[PDB]
């Protein structure tokens, strides 16, 4: 299928699956030339390939050298993404290969299907979920490894840190998508919420701060407030006048 009518629970079952987001593969700054024309300068990108059950993130860093002397880069980027995901699958033992690959953008379907013709039993699916994985590059440690890369590189992460020790995959993914939605909507405000308390640190081997269960509730609340505040700013809506049904819909509706 896709995810039109939707069952979200399928993400947390025991069928290995990966989300693939290509939104940060081809990244440019647009600038004026000496003659007053416009040119692009590519910067390092990444493929965001996530197992939503385990948290396992396969961050393939796309070094700007990939693009050298190539044409139609936005088109090529899809095919390079598909080439790298197929290489990742082929690199995994049979028992670790995904049964499904969910692409966040429908333009990735043909490229990935064509690269995976050798795997007729791996389903390539779109999603009706509007996932904020573009905001991956707002996670300091991920942005830092991408921008420092001098060569193509794969780096492995657990995007849930140690959360699965305490919460289910469903709850971990809900927390991740709320944090990424907040970073996408107002990065500065989101980082101030996460990092402003001097007493709470990020472990060397983690991406997010070491919040107690009660602190995660406060943070989650502050993130939901940030998203609602920005929706009122955007649409000139008095949020103080909204109900909980109204408020709940706006966050997940997003």
């Amino acid at each position: 299928g896709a995810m039109n009518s939707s069952n979200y629970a399928e993400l947390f079952n025991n069928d290995i699956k990966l989300f693939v987001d290509d939104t940060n593969v081809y990244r440019v700054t647009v600038h004026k030339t000496f003659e007053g024309n416009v040119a692009t300068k590519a910067i390092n990108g990444c493929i965001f390939t996530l197992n939503p059950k385990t948290g396992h993130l396969f961050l393939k860093i796309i070094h700007t050298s990939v693009w050298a002397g190539q044409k139609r880069l936005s088109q090529l980027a899809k095919w390079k993404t598909a080439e790298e995901v197929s290489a990742l699958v082929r690199s995994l033992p049979k028992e670790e290969q995904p049964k499904q690959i969910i692409v966040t953008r429908k333009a990735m379907l043909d490229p990935l299907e064509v690269h995976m013709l050798d795997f007729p039993n791996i389903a390539i699916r779109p999603t009706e979920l509007r996932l904020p994985f573009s905001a991956a590059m707002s996670i300091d440690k991920l942005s830092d490894v991408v921008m420092k890369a001098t060569e193509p590189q794969m780096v492995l992460f657990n995007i849930y840190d140690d959360w699965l020790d305490r919460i289910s995959s469903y709850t971990a993914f809900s927390r991740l998508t709320l944090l990424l939605r907040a970073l996408k909507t107002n990065e500065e405000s989101a980082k101030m919420i996460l990092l402003s308390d001097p007493t709470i640190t990020i472990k060397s081997y983690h991406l997010w701060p070491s919040f107690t269960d009660e602190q995660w509730i406060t943070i989650e609340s502050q993130m939901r407030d940030l998203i609602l505040t920005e929706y009122g700013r955007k649409y000139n809506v008095n949020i103080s006048a909204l109900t909980q049904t109204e408020i709940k819909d706006i966050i997940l509706g997003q």
């Binding site: 088109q75 095919w79 043909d110 490229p111 064509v114 013709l117 050798d118």
Partner: protein, 300 residues
């Protein structure tokens, strides 16, 4: 000028012979079709007056044998049969001609329509797509499935068109995924032309046959094959100039012959718009573009 006599016409029926058709009433003194041009394959087709679901026919070449039609009241259809006795066949045809019981194949001298639709079509190649090896003629009908449709049921009663699948290991060389998917030249030139069809004549022969089966029988799988064979050329950056010029002629005559009232069922909007306006060959099909824009501007 060859003849396909009929034993009789016991049931009311619309009879097609190539691009022509006429109505026969129940038990009309109709004893067949004379003056059929030698040098081409022909198709004699039927649609029963009492049941338009009965739509079927026979591809034949009068150079291959003496063929006649006889209604079978058990199977409920007009059957083609081969008469092996030359002198009986000549004697029957002579009697029906003298009594003027046959309609004449109504070919206008100036008119090359049928040659233009069947240039590359050979009875020997049709018998490879439609295999009933005991007969010299080939039965097709509206319902017959293709080998590709049967992969996506009866294997004997099927149209063995060459399977074209843009997202198949056959179409895509490992390591050339983007290249082969965006530019179908490898699939057209190496796999299909060099590998399967051996030459453009055979490729055009199946393309033309698929069109004719789509038009005369409303055969849906045939319509899919015709469009897939157009799209495979139009989606290739590298095509021999002689093949582009000939395809433009082939499609021009097909679009010219297509009855206007069937254009909604027989033409795929996506394929034609892609072929004429977005493909590598968008500027290569001058005659086809002009007749399509003048006859079917709504589709485009």
């Amino acid at each position: 000028m060859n003849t396909v006599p009929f034993t009789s016409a016991p049931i009311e029926v619309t009879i097609g012979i190539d691009q022509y058709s006429f109505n026969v009433k129940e038990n009309q003194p109709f004893h067949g079709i004379k003056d059929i041009p030698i040098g081409h394959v022909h198709v004699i087709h039927f649609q029963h007056a009492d049941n338009s679901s009965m739509r079927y026919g026979y591809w034949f070449d009068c150079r291959m044998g003496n063929f006649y039609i006889q209604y079978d009241p058990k199977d409920g259809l007009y059957k083609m049969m081969e008469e092996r006795d030359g002198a009986k066949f000549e004697n029957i045809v002579h009697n029906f001609k003298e009594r003027q019981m046959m309609v004449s194949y109504p070919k206008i001298d100036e008119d090359d329509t049928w040659y233009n639709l069947t240039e590359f079509v050979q009875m020997d190649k049709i018998r490879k797509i439609v295999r009933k090896d005991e007969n010299q003629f080939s039965y097709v009908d509206s319902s017959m499935t293709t080998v590709q449709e049967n992969e996506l049921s009866d294997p004997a009663h099927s149209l063995n068109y060459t399977v074209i699948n843009f997202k198949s290991r056959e179409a895509i060389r490992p390591g050339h995924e983007m290249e082969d998917f965006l530019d179908k030249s490898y699939y057209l030139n190496t796999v299909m032309l060099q590998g399967i069809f051996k030459n453009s004549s055979n490729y055009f022969g199946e393309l033309q046959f698929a069109f004719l089966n789509a038009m005369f029988f409303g055969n849906y799988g045939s319509s899919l094959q015709w469009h897939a064979m157009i799209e495979l050329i139009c989606s290739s950056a590298t095509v021999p100039k002689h093949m582009l010029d000939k395809l433009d002629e082939i499609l021009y005559y097909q679009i010219k012959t297509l009855p206007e009232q069937y254009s909604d069922i027989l033409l795929n909007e996506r394929v034609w718009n892609i072929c004429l306006y977005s493909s590598f060959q968008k500027n290569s099909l001058h005659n086809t573009e002009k007749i399509m824009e003048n006859k079917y501007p709504e589709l485009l």
